Design a protein around this ligand. Sequence first.
Ligand SMILES: [Ca+2]
Ligand SMILES: [Ca+2]
Ligand SMILES: [Ca+2]
Ligand SMILES: [La+3]
Length: 147
Amino acid sequence: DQLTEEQIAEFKEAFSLFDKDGDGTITTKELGTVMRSLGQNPTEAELQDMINEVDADGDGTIDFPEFLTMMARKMKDTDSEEEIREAFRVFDKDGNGYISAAELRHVMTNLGEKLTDEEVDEMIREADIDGDGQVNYEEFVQMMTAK
Ligand SMILES: [Ca+2]
Ligand SMILES: [Ca+2]
Ligand SMILES: [Ca+2]
Ligand SMILES: [La+3]
């Protein structure tokens, strides 16, 4: 019961990356494309269940308001313990305990945002507390709790 301007901004950014055609609806093809690039393999039946969960009007696809609710369930309900480690493994593929600028940029590119290499290195230094030029799991959760 509030809804901030920053909140809507975060959702809108994610929604634009999902909807490749920007028609306002997310099909199983679009939803599956994002998850497939994140190192996951969800089937047609699996992707459909995700859409039906937030299907307010039951049109078969994910609309703008339906997507807002979907993100509110994961980013504002779940993800506390044994769930952040799974997300960390998505960025750090080799699992060395450190997320380099190359790994972060790779995941972002798969999402849809093809940022520059220099921009990603600026993000790394932001979460870099020990000054090693990388982001470990300890620094990952630290930045995940902050803006
Ligand atoms: Ca679409
Ligand atoms: Ca690594
Ligand atoms: Ca570090
Ligand atoms: La819908």
